[PDB]
């Protein structure tokens, strides 16, 4: 179903969202920048 | 050196040799005025009139004019407007060629190397100014240092111009191998050169200038006292205006001739643009060349006159007023012909 | 630290040979060869030489020359055609008894428009070859060129052909400014052939030239 | 998908900055790719070499002269042993990295592509798809060097192709507004995907593998997933004309790159498809851009004849 695909999709996205340096900001010692 | 700034008051070249008379009444030190003379001898006539056999005499016992003044006020903020609107374009000049699209262009690189040329002009002035305001002078070293930066950018100025002058030369009419002969490394190479080319020539210029009370005079030992005058207006004005005419001579003519012969000359803006900038330079410049190739012959008496003497003086001063103008000139007329140039002043406005 | 100044001056190193590797490549003019499926006959009577293209190294004058072939690329041209820019010249071989063969010339005619208008060769000219021209004449005499061309309105004499020929392939370059068609018509002799491509070459090498300065 | 994503939070603005600037190449680039070690990245140009950049200490540490000049794309092996180049002579070259005696040699030099090959992908360490310009994918094998599997099923020239996080899946896009996938082990294609206008130039998976973005000519880019499969979203932006050159994606997925040629990239929002940020660092048409698997460090390359790397 289209809306179970979205669903999964923003789940799989809120998921790693934290696990992502881009999406929020991360020490620059921390990343090699 | 820099023959236009002095505190040169009386010269005496007519009359050196006088007899021993009471009508000496003292002797001023025209040595430290300008060092170009000697001591001068004053009679008691309520004039200002003009040895060995003498000088013991003396101490027994015991003309420039002030028009110069008047012109150095006036020249003097004549130089402080001149840096302003100098400066700011020759700046603006710089970062546009640094931030360029296409890097690695031999053109690029040699008009940016004539832009710090010029900027060594500027730079070096305001010490000039500095020194006319206050008859002060700085640690008797900073007339020395700005006298031989003058002479570098100079130098380095006119040296810049040529090779630009020969590359296009090159780059125009022996297309078939001058891209195999230069490159960027090469063109980076002998901008190096040139630049050492100028320490070199302007080595000798201000290679004896040890900077007097309140202007740059001159050691010149013994030997040289003579040579070191000849040879620093000699030199300034064979590699100076002469032989880079010749060369500026010899390729212009060619690119045109090849321009002519593709029917290209419709085309050649880009070629026009420096050519307008090489004539003016040689207009602007050759009150001065011609000047200091006079007051060369001087040392031969071809202007014995003393109102003569005073012309060549006043000539030599606004000449070099003129060549302080030409430097921040040179920007504008890059202004008026170029064409991305004015983008860039639209795109920083 | 001693690894990373290893790395460093192994970098240094290699990016001045690759600073010199471009350099030398910039040292060689590259052209581009187009047509109508017939080209490469510069290429076969040039006696001498040094797969989607064709790279033929070529020298003369003391100067190299790069070719690429593209005719066996059947793919959209556009989109393999903006990667051939900064090419010095391209050259265009087209056969001129291809009008009465069938629609050929109107192909070409179509092509040649579609390279001019491809906002992409703007400031690289392009070298117009005239192929089979010992043909021509006899294939001339027969076809009054009518058919190809309507409203012809000239003789049949091979002078006035040729020149209107021509002056189609002035009509095309609706920029004549920026880039400048130079057109000869291809012989046995590869010395006029060739003397024709070097001239073509230093004109637009002068071209370019004139467009390096910081000003613009 | 917008009435779906009405509720969750925009990232917003972001303040992308160059976080180093590399200068190597004095020509254009075409392609480039992110490398397993996070560290590496593989460009090329028109200069006749491939060279392997090292993000993280700004240096060049391979230089493999290439010899066909003018390559049109290069991928790096998840392995980091392989790096493939393509190019107009409708071979794919292989070259070592250090494999033996710690210089950089050609391993094979696969051939028998007709058309300009577009895009190249290490699909295992073994195995190599590529894309050519003759609307046919060939998936080669380095031991052998022959066509394993051929697929013919696209009418137009292909141009790029991306690879599946199982490395069992790949997809690509030609001129025809028609992009349907092809798997590995059935060898035949299974989902057709439809909706375009124009020609399609970026291909890549979501992170997730269940969909994919891809970048038209019309300034517009689409997401297709295997459930829908009927573009259920679509981003747009109703300000400019040009075409899109290639699309990536962030770690999450939660962040889009768009390679669109007006001088800068675009960064939109995969679900929320509203603009998140601008990268105006290129002077040149910007044809290359990839996110890296753990998304440190992003890079960015362009006709300008530089890259930028963004953090
Ligand atoms: C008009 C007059 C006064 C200017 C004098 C012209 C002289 C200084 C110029 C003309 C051409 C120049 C040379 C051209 C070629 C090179 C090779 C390069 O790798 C080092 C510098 C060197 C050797 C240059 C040094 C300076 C040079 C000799
Ligand atoms: C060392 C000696 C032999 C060098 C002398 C070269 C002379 C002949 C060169 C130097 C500059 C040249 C001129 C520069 C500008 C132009 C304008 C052009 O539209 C017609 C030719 C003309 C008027 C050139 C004619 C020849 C010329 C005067």
Redesign the pocket.
Known sequence: KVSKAAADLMAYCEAHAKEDPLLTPVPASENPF | QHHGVTKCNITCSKMTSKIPVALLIHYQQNQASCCKRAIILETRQHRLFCEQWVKDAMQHLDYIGDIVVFGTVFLSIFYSVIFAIGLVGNLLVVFALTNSKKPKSVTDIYLLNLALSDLLFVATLPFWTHYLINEKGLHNAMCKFTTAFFFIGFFGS??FL??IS?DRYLAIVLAANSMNNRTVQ?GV??S???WA?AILVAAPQFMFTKQKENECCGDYPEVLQEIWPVLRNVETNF?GFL??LL?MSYCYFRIIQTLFSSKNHKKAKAIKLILLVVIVFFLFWTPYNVVIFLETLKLYDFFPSCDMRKDLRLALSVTETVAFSHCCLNPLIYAFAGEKFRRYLYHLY | SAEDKAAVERSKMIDRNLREDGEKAAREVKLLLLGAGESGKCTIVKQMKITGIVETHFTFKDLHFKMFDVTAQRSERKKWIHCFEGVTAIIFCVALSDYDLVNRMHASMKLFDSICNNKWFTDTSIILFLNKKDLFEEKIKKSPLTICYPEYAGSNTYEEAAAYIQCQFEDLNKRKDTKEIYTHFTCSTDTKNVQFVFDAVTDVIIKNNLKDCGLF | LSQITNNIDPVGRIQMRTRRTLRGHLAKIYAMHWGTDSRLLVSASQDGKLIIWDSYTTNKVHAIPLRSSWVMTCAYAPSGNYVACGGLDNICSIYNLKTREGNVRVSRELAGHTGYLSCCRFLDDNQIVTSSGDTTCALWDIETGQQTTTFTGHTGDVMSLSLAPDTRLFVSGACDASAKLWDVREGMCRQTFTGHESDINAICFFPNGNAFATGSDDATCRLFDLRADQELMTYSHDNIICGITSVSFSKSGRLLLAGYDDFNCNVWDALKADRAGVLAGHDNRVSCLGVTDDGMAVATGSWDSFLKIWN
């Open positions: 006119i040296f040529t090779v020969i090469h190479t002998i190096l050169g040139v080319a590699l032989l880079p060369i």
